[PDB]
Amino acid sequence: EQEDVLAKELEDVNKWGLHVFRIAELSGNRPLTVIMHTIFQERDLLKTFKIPVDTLITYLMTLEDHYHADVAYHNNIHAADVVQSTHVLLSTPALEAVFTDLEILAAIFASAIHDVDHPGVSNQFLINTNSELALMYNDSSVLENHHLAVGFKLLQEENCDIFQNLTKKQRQSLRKMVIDIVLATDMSKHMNLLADLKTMVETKKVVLLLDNYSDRIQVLQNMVHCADLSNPTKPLQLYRQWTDRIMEEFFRQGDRERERGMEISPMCDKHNASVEKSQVGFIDYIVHPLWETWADLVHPDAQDILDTLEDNREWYQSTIP
Ligand SMILES: Nc1ncnc2c1ncn2[C@@H]1O[C@H](COP(=O)(O)O)[C@@H](O)[C@H]1O
Ligand SMILES: [Mg+2]
Ligand SMILES: [Zn+2]
Known part of the structure; x- marks a missing residue:
C-alpha cells in the first residue's frame, strides 16, 4: 500500500505544487530517483536516447x-x-515545440545534478574560510563548478553512463548546455541573467520564436534559475517547509561563522534574525523581479504561479506587524 500511495502522489508530476516531501518519505528517501524516472518515462526519454x-x-x-x-x-x-x-x-504552452529533445534532456539533467554534494554553506563562506573548494576553483562559481564536476564524474561508475547511446556530437552539445545551465544558478550572476531575460522579453517575437543557441540557452538558464528559486511561488504549506529548511542551514552557517570570529552573514544570525522580514525582502528584491519577468516572457501561462507568489508575499508581510 505504500507503493500505491506513492503512485497516487506521482500522478501530480505535471502540476505545480506536487507533494514532494510526501514523495520523499513514501519512496524511502528516493524522491530524486522516482521523480526523475517518472519524468523520463512521461517524456519518453529512455526510448528517444536509448537509455537502459x-x-x-x-x-x-x-x-x-x-x-x-x-x-x-x-x-x-x-x-x-x-x-x-x-x-x-x-x-508551458508558450514554449511548445521550441526546444529539441537534447535541450530538454540537458535542462532536466542539469536540474538533477545542480546542487550535488552541497556542504550546506555558501560560496562566500567557502571563499572567506579559504576552503579547499575555493582554492580549487579560484573563488569563481565555486559550488556550481563542483556540482557539475561531481554530476559528470558519476556517469563513469559501473552501469551509470545514461548517455552511452548518444552520438559524440550529442554528448559534446549536451555537456556544454549542462555546464552553461548549472553555472547560471550561481547567485552572483542573477542580476546579469535577469537583465538579459528582460531584454529578451522586450524584443520577443512569436508560441515564442527562438532560433539561435544564444537565445535558447539563455531561456533554459533562466528557466532552471526560476525553478531553483521557485519555493516562494509554491502553495504555502510547501513554501513554509522550504523556508524552515533554508533558515536552519543559514543559522548553522552563522554558528560556524560566529565560532570562527567572522562577521555573521545576512539572515544567518539566530540571535538577530527575522525570518518573515527576510522572506519579504527575498521576494521583493530577487524572486518577484525574476518571476514577473518570466511571466511576461510566457504571458499569460505563468499567471497562477505569479499570483501564488504575490499571495505568499502578502501572507509573510501580514505576520510582521
Ligand atoms: N526561501 C528562501 N529565502 C531566502 N533565500 C532563499 C530562499 N530560497 C532560495 N534562497 C536563496 O537562493 C539561493 C539559491 O541557490 P542554492 O542555495 O544553491 O539552491 C540560496 O543560496 C539562497 O541564498
Ligand atoms: Mg546551487
Ligand atoms: Zn539549488
Missing part, C-alpha cells in the same frame, strides 16, 4: 546518494523539486 532503464536507475541512486542527508535544504528533496519544477516550466 537499469542504467538510469543506477545513475540516479548514485547521484542521489551524493546529496547530503544532513543538510536541511540543499539535499535530494531540493534536487527533486528543481527537477520537477523545470519539467513543469518546460511544458
Whole structure:
C-alpha cells in the first residue's frame, strides 16, 4: 500500500505544487530517483536516447546518494523539486515545440545534478574560510563548478553512463548546455541573467520564436534559475517547509561563522534574525523581479504561479506587524 500511495502522489508530476516531501518519505528517501524516472518515462526519454532503464536507475541512486542527508535544504528533496519544477516550466504552452529533445534532456539533467554534494554553506563562506573548494576553483562559481564536476564524474561508475547511446556530437552539445545551465544558478550572476531575460522579453517575437543557441540557452538558464528559486511561488504549506529548511542551514552557517570570529552573514544570525522580514525582502528584491519577468516572457501561462507568489508575499508581510 505504500507503493500505491506513492503512485497516487506521482500522478501530480505535471502540476505545480506536487507533494514532494510526501514523495520523499513514501519512496524511502528516493524522491530524486522516482521523480526523475517518472519524468523520463512521461517524456519518453529512455526510448528517444536509448537509455537502459537499469542504467538510469543506477545513475540516479548514485547521484542521489551524493546529496547530503544532513543538510536541511540543499539535499535530494531540493534536487527533486528543481527537477520537477523545470519539467513543469518546460511544458508551458508558450514554449511548445521550441526546444529539441537534447535541450530538454540537458535542462532536466542539469536540474538533477545542480546542487550535488552541497556542504550546506555558501560560496562566500567557502571563499572567506579559504576552503579547499575555493582554492580549487579560484573563488569563481565555486559550488556550481563542483556540482557539475561531481554530476559528470558519476556517469563513469559501473552501469551509470545514461548517455552511452548518444552520438559524440550529442554528448559534446549536451555537456556544454549542462555546464552553461548549472553555472547560471550561481547567485552572483542573477542580476546579469535577469537583465538579459528582460531584454529578451522586450524584443520577443512569436508560441515564442527562438532560433539561435544564444537565445535558447539563455531561456533554459533562466528557466532552471526560476525553478531553483521557485519555493516562494509554491502553495504555502510547501513554501513554509522550504523556508524552515533554508533558515536552519543559514543559522548553522552563522554558528560556524560566529565560532570562527567572522562577521555573521545576512539572515544567518539566530540571535538577530527575522525570518518573515527576510522572506519579504527575498521576494521583493530577487524572486518577484525574476518571476514577473518570466511571466511576461510566457504571458499569460505563468499567471497562477505569479499570483501564488504575490499571495505568499502578502501572507509573510501580514505576520510582521
Ligand atoms: N526561501 C528562501 N529565502 C531566502 N533565500 C532563499 C530562499 N530560497 C532560495 N534562497 C536563496 O537562493 C539561493 C539559491 O541557490 P542554492 O542555495 O544553491 O539552491 C540560496 O543560496 C539562497 O541564498
Ligand atoms: Mg546551487
Ligand atoms: Zn539549488
